[PDB]
Amino acid sequence: TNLCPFDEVFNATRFASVYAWNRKRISNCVADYSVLYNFAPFFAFKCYGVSPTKLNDLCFTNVYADSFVIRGNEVSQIAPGQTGNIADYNYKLPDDFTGCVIAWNSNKLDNYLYRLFRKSNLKPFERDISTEIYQAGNKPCNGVAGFNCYFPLRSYGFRPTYGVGHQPYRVVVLSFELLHAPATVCGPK
């Protein structure tokens, strides 16, 4: 019993942005992977490292799930560390990290935001919710937009039939964290 929400947090309406995610910890519960492992058609799957066929057996201290609506072909960027504008600015997964990502296209379901380049490369696992002015030029722009003054974030709102490769994708990342002295959170019996 006491199944994790899983489906609810995955079938959730009004999905969040991409530059500003919402890391949700999943607390002590018994989580069957059948609904995630097997689904309605489409709904691609891309799981690295450790595989469910033995996660059904072993136990994990705790897990985090993050959700976002990244569009385009850059869904390849969520993979072992690859240099690409999405990766180093809309956060990069660490190489040693062995969680799994599941993506599928969203057109029937769907004004949205997309993070622009930062002043420097960014380490994994920190949010960059931030509205300031990017200082490209040596001349301190220190205010409203001008030469080398770019306000981050972009949009693609209301884009029906923009191209089969351009359709709105959405993807979710799961990370299994094993802190010292495990407590709970096992597989189904």
Binding site: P41, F42, F43, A44, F45, K46, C47, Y48, G49, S51, N73, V75, S76, A79, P80, A103, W104, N105, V164, Y169
Partner: protein, 32 residues
């Protein structure tokens, strides 16, 4: 017809060796 190139578990509908996967169910999975 999906199929998994990584030596095991073919997949049926109605590249590169990184690790264990199950991908390319849609048309996004490949690059060429």
């Amino acid at each position: 017809a999906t199929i998994s190139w990584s030596g095991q578990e073919p997949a049926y509908a109605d590249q590169y060796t990184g690790a264990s996967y199950s991908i390319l169910r849609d048309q996004v999975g490949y690059d060429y």
